[PDB]
Amino acid sequence: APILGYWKIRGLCDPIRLLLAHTGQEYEMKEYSIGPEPGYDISEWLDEKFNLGLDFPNLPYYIDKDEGVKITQTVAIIRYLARKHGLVGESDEETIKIEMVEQQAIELTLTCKRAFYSKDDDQFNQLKEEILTSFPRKLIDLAKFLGENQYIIGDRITYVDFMLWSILDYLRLFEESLFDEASSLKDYLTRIESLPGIEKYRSSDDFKRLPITAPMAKFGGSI
Amino acid sequence: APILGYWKIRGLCDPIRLLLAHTGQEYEMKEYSIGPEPGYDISEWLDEKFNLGLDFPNLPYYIDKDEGVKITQTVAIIRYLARKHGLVGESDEETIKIEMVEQQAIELTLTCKRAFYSKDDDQFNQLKEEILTSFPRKLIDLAKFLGENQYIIGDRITYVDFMLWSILDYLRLFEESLFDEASSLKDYLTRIESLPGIEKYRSSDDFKRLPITAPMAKFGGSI
Ligand SMILES: N[C@@H](CCC(=O)N[C@@H](CSC(=S)NCc1ccccc1)C(=O)NCC(=O)O)C(=O)O
Ligand SMILES: N[C@@H](CCC(=O)N[C@@H](CSC(=S)NCc1ccccc1)C(=O)NCC(=O)O)C(=O)O
Ligand SMILES: N[C@@H](CCC(=O)N[C@@H](CSC(=S)NCc1ccccc1)C(=O)NCC(=O)O)C(=O)O
Ligand SMILES: N[C@@H](CCC(=O)N[C@@H](CSC(=S)NCc1ccccc1)C(=O)NCC(=O)O)C(=O)O
C-alpha cells in the first residue's frame, strides 16, 4: 500500500487527502506527532527525515514501493495522484484553466499560512488586514471564473477543485463574511463536501481530530 | 505575435524570458514602468489591469490572440510555453522529478522575495538569517539531485532549469558564499548562461537595464 506522510494536522496536505478520499484509493497515513508545549517535540519525523530515501526530505511525502515512487512537494504529489486518477485536463484549454486556478489557490493558501504562523500579534494583524482587504476581490474573480459550472473546468471535478475547496474551507472557518460577494462559492463548498468519499472522510474520527494548523500557530492550532 | 506583460524588472518573469530566449520565440515584451519614489506610480498597469480580458488580472500575463490564449500566473505561463516548445517530461519519472524541482525552486524564490521586499530592517535581517541558515542544506539537496547531470533530467534541458537558474543567479548575486564554493551548481549556472539564446539575451541592452526587484525592495532595486 502507498504511504502518505504528514503532521497530525490538515495543513498543506489537506487537498491530497481530499483527492484520495474522493477516489477511494487505498493508502497508509503515516502521521507525525508534535509534542506538547513548550518543546513541540518532533523527534519521530526528525529521526526519519533523512532515512526515507527522499531527494528533497520534507512533509508531506508519498512513497509507493510497488510503483517505485518517492515524492515530496505537495503540488508534485497531488499532480502525480491527479494523473494516476484521471483528475487532470483532457485539453490544453482545460489544462491552462486548471493551472491558473492551482496557482490562485496556492497564492491564497500561502498568504493564509504566513498569517497563521506569524511571530507576533503585530505581524498577524498586518497579514490579517491584507487578507480582509484583498481577498474579497480575489473571491469575486474565482466566482466569476467558476460562473455557472459545477467545478473549475465544468461538469468534471479535477485535482484543483480539492486545492480550492481546502483554502475556501479554511477561510470560511477564519472569516465567513468574506463570501458576502460570492454565494456561488458557498454552493461550491457544499457540492464538493457532499461527494460521498469526501463526506465519509470529513465525518471520520481521524479527520475530526485534525487541527487546521500546528500547535504554535496564531489560528487553527486547536480543533 | 504573442505578448508577455511585466514590470521592467527580472523578478518572477525572469525564467519565462530565459525560456523564450532559449527557444528563439518571437514575442512582444509589454513593459510597465514604476514611477520615481516616493509615489512609485504604476498607472499604466492600473489603467489596463481590468481591460485585458484576463480571468485573474496580474503580472506577468501572456496573451496570444492568434492561438486564442490569455494566461496569468507565472507557473501556468511557463508550463504552457514548455508544452508548446517541448520542454517538459517525456515520461512520468521525468515529470515527477521536474515538478519536485519546480516546487523546490519556487520555495527558494518566495523566501528570497519575502526577504527582498521586507518592510523593516528587522524583518530583512530575520529572513536573511533563515536563508543563510537553511539554504546551504537545500543547495546540497539540489546538487545531490543534479549529480553528474548537465540538467535536472539529464542531457535534456527542461523549463525547470530556467526556474532554477534564475533563483540560483539571484542567490549568487545576493550571497555568493552560498555559491562561491558551490562547485556543481556554479558549473550548472555557467552551462546554461553559455547556451547561445541565453548568451544573446543576457548580453542585450534590454536585459542589462533590468533590476532584479522593484524600486521599493531592500535588495535588487538597482540595475
Ligand atoms: N515546498 C514544500 C514545503 C513543505 C513544508 O513547508 N512543510 C512543513 C509542513 S506544512 C504546514 S505546517 N502547513 C500548515 C498550513 C496551515 C494553513 C494553510 C496552509 C498550511 C514542514 O513541517 N516540513 C518539514 C521540514 O521542514 O522538515 C511543499 O510544497 O510541500
Ligand atoms: N500582489 C499579488 C500577491 C501575491 C502574493 O504575494 N501571494 C502570496 C505569495 S504566492 C506567489 S508570489 N507565488 C508566485 C510565484 C511564482 C513563481 C515563483 C515564485 C512565486 C503571499 O504569501 N503573499 C502575502 C504574504 O506575503 O503573506 C497578487 O495580487 O496576486
Ligand atoms: N500568483 C501570481 C502572483 C504574481 C504577483 O505577485 N505579481 C506582482 C509582481 S511580481 C514581483 S514584483 N517580483 C519580484 C521578485 C524578485 C525576486 C525574486 C522573486 C520575485 C504584481 O505586482 N502583480 C500585479 C498586481 O498585483 O496587480 C503569479 O504567480 O504570477
Ligand atoms: N519550512 C519548509 C518550507 C520553506 C518555505 O516556507 N518556503 C517558502 C514558502 S513556499 C511553500 S510553503 N509552498 C508550498 C505550498 C504548497 C501548496 C500550497 C501552498 C504552499 C517561504 O516563503 N518561506 C519563507 C516565508 O514564508 O517567509 C522547508 O524548510 O522546507
A113 alpha carbon, closest ligand: 1
Q: How far apart are CA A149 and CA A157, in angstroms?
A: 10
- Residue A83 to residue B76, Cβ atoms within 8 A: no
Q: State how far the Cα of A70 lies from the Cα of A198, in Å rounded to an integer.
A: 25
Residue for grid cell 503515516: A30
Judge contact between B215 and B42, C-beta under 8 A.
no
| Beta strands across the sheet bearing B3-7 | B28-32, B3-7, B61-64, B69-72
Task: Give dist(CA B51, CA B30) in Å, integer.
Answer: 15
Q: Is B6 annotated as a binding residue?
A: yes
Q: How far does the centroid of ligand 3 lie from the alpha carbon of residue A51, in Å? A: 37
* Nearest CA-CA partner of B117 in B24, B11, B223, B28: B11
From B56, B85, B67, B83, select the one nearest B3 (Cα to Cα): B67
* Nearest alpha carbon, ligand 1 atom 9: A59
Q: Determined by which method?
A: X-ray
CATH number for the region A92-195 comes to 1.20.1050.10
**C-beta B110 within 6 A of ligand 4:** yes
List, in sequence order, the alpha helices (H) in chain B.
14-23, 43-46, 74-85, 92-116, 121-146, 159-174, 176-179, 183-193, 196-202, 205-208
Q: Which of A69, A92, A100 sits opposite B56 (nearest CB)?
A: A100
Mutate to test the pocket of ligand 4, among A14, A61, A71, A110 (most ligand atoms within 8 A of CB): A110
DSSP annotation of B141: H
Is B117 annotated to bind a ligand? Reply is: yes
Residues of chain A in Cβ contact (below 8 Å) with chain B: 55-57, 69, 71-76, 79-80, 83, 92, 95-96, 99-100, 102-104, 110, 141, 144-145
Q: Which of A47, A59, A162 to mutate to test the pocket of ligand 1 (most atoms within 8 A of CB)?
A: A59
The CA-atom distances, in angstroms, between B43 and each of B37, B48, B60, B213 are 14, 8, 16, 18
Task: Indicate the domain borders of chain A.
Answer: 3-86+201-208, 92-195
Ligand 1 close to Cβ of residue A62 (< 6 A)? no
Best of A52, A55, A59 to mutate (most B CBs within 10 Å, chain B): A55
CA A114–ligand 4 middle distance (angstroms): 9
Q: Tell the CATH topology of A3-86+201-208.
A: Glutaredoxin (3.40.30)
Give how far Cα B85 sits from Cα of A79, B13, B89, Å: 21, 17, 12
Cis-peptide, bond into residue B38, ω within 30° of zero: yes
DSSP characters for chain A?
A: --EEEEESS-GGGHHHHHHHHHHT---EEEEE----TTT---HHHHTTTTSS--SS--SSEEEETTTTEEEESHHHHHHHHHHHHT-S-SSHHHHHHHHHHHHHHHHHHHHHHHHHT-SSHHHHHHHHHHHHHHHHHHHHHHHHHHTT-SBTTBSS--HHHHHHHHHHHHHHHH-GGGGTT-HHHHHHHHHHHHSHHHHHHHTSHHHHT--SS-TT-SSSS--
Q: For residue A94, give the nearest of A45, A152, A48, A37 by alpha carbon.
A: A152
B62: helix, strand or coil: strand
User: Of A55, A100, A145, which has the smallest distance from its Cβ to B100's Cβ?
Assistant: A55
Sign of CA dihedral A82, A144, A112, A187: negative
State how far residue B35 is from chain A, nearest Cα, in angstroms: 23
Indicate the residue of B56, B79, B110 with minimum beta-carbon distance to A141: B56
Enumerate the residues of chain B whose CB falls inside 8 A of the CB of residue A75. Answer: 99, 102-103
Binding site annotation covers A61?
A: no
Write out chain B residues lying below 8 Å of A145, CB-based.
55-56
Q: A168 alpha carbon to ligand 4 midpoint, in Å?
A: 19
The angstrom resolution of this structure is 2.0
Task: Compute, in angstroms, the gap from residue B147 CA to the centroid of ligand 2.
Answer: 31
- Residue A191 buriedness (CB in 10 A; 0-12 / 13-18 / 19+): middle
Beta-sheet strand order (sheet of A69-72): A28-32, A3-7, A61-64, A69-72
Pick the CATH number of B3-86+200-208 from 3.40.30.10, 3.40.50.1980, 3.30.465.10, 3.40.50.300: 3.40.30.10
